[PDB]
Amino acid sequence: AMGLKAAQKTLFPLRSIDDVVRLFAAELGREEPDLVLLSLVLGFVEHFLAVNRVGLTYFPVADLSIIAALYARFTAQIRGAVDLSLYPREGGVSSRELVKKVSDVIWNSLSRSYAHIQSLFSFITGTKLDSSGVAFAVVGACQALGLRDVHLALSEDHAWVVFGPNGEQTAEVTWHGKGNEDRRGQTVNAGVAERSWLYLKGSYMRCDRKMEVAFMVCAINPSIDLHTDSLELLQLQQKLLWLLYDLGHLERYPMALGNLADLEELEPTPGRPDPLTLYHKGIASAKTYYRDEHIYPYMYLAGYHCRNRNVREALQAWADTATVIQDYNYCREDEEIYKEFFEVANDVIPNLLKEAASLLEAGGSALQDPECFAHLLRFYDGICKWEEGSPTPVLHVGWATFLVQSLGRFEGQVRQKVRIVSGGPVLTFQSEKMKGMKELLVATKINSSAIKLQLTAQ
Numbered sequence: 001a002m003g004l005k006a007a008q009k010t011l012f013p014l015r016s017i018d019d020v021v022r023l024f025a026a027e028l029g030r031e032e033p034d035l036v037l038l039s040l041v042l043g044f045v046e047h048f049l050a051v052n053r054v055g056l057t058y059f060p061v062a063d064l065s066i067i068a069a070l071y072a073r074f075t076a077q078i079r080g081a082v083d084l085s086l087y088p089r090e091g092g093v094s095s096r097e098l099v100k101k102v103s104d105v106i107w108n109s110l111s112r113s114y115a116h117i118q119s120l121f122s123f124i125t126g127t128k129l130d131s132s133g134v135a136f137a138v139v140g141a142c143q144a145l146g147l148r149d150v151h152l153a154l155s156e157d158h159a160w161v162v163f164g165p166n167g168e169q170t171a172e173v174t175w176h177g178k179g180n181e182d183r184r185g186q187t188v189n190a191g192v193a194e195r196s197w198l199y200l201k202g203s204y205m206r207c208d209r210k211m212e213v214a215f216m217v218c219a220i221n222p223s224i225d226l227h228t229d230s231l232e233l234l235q236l237q238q239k240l241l242w243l244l245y246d247l248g249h250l251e252r253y254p255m256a257l258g259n260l261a262d263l264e265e266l267e268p269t270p271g272r273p274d275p276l277t278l279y280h281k282g283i284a285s286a287k288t289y290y291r292d293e294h295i296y297p298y299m300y301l302a303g304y305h306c307r308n309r310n311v312r313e314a315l316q317a318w319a320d321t322a323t324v325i326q327d328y329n330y331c332r333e334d335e336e337i338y339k340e341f342f343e344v345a346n347d348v349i350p351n352l353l354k355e356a357a358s359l360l361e362a363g364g365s366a367l368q369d370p371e372c373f374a375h376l377l378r379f380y381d382g383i384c385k386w387e388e389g390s391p392t393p394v395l396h397v398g399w400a401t402f403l404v405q406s407l408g409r410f411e412g413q414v415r416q417k418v419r420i421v422s423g424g425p426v427l428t429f430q431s432e433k434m435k436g437m438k439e440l441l442v443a444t445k446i447n448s449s450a451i452k453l454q455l456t457a458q
């Protein structure tokens with residue numbers, strides 16, 4: 001809420017990972033965990049840990065005087081720029097004018113030219129924030145002002161704020177991508193209606209205060225450089241996510257559950273569910289609360305199967321990913337999920353199949369399994385169907401080169417044992433393009449040129 005309390009101050013100084021966890025455990029018992037206090041603590045700790053060092057053990061001590069001074073600076077800056085008497089508050093509901101004023105206060109503070117700039121620590125000490133950091137700063141600013149209805153909203157690649165009753169009102173508060181036109185102040189209604197992945201068809205997350213704590217924990221970046229992660233930051237993020245898990249605050253947060261599964265893959269915690277249980281809990285959350293319209297729950301699971309060389313389930317999970325994305329329209333600012341499908345289609349899957357081909361060279365493999373070929377076809381069907389109704393095209397000559405190569409990783413005998421139905425394993429296509437070349441996909445010899453122009457047709 002507002003003002004540091006003795007119950008928080010007695011927990012200082014923070015001298016270890018477990019000290020930070022204990023501060024978070026106390027704040028998560030409050031009805032209103034202090035977003036400014038917790039973000040400053042995480043940003044401080046991350047700032048001094050995300051460096052290569054000499055010294056086996058090291059923890060940067062979060063002295064209260066330092067944290068409380070930064071907290072006072074944030075609060076003074078917000079209370080001194082936002083006069084609440086000029087904005088009437090009709091029974092708890094903040095107005096769009098007030099919410100936009102706070103957004104502008106944050107925005108106008110940013111440095112005008114410029115990793116680890118996600119926290120309020122970075123905001124106060126260096127006037128820098130990344131994109132979703134701005135939207136978090138706005139929610140923390142509003143909590144500092146008493147606006148109990150202003151909350152963070154998150155898709156899988158963007159953030160904004162919701163407010164009013166039940167989060168009825170939406171407002172853009174930050175940028176997305178690089179060269180895009182500013183939409184700050186506007187509603188996200190256009191984004192929902194265009195059926196872009198960026199806005200999730202309205203199936204995005206609306207946080208309570210405690211899901212906002214989960215966000216900032218997920219936002220911890222342990223990366224030191226391109227080769228090195230901070231183990232202390234990974235262990236801190238992992239323990240915080242278990243604390244959140246235990247209190248039920250990940251129940252509606254699929255990406256956090258995927259993140260925790262990844263951390264348990266890296267370093268299993270004794271007595272806790274295994275990664276596969278956690279990946280599927282993430283998928284179950286997305287089905288339960290978000291109409292099964294999220295991509296990353298299946299990308300998380302696919303990556304795990306891929307790393308463990310469960311080729312069939314990896315291709316299964318990647319097809320599920322395509323089955324979700326087929327109902328979207330590829331818009332301009334959807335590039336992050338495009339790059340992911342590109343990498344899966346034209347790098348990861350070829351490598352998986354090429355490794356599988358080498359294994360047959362010297363010995364029940366997936367290249368002799370028709371199910372895996374079915375998964376591969378459902379994956380490409382979803383991406384073709386995704387392209388339908390989309391403004392800009394998805395597939396091009398490069399996709400066709402690796403589709404051809406991937407189909408040719410299966411013996412024509414093996415591919416022939418899959419039944420393809422239009423709109424042994426049986427599979428039903430949904431896209432015009434895949435239906436159009438259904439014949440080419442089962443011939444003992446693959447007309448590469450023919451498939452290439454059909455997959456690239458208008």
Ligand SMILES: COc1ccccc1CN
Pocket residue numbers: 258296299300340
């Ligand atoms: C599961 O994949 C994720 C999750 C979050 C961000 C990016 C990716 C793609 N590597």
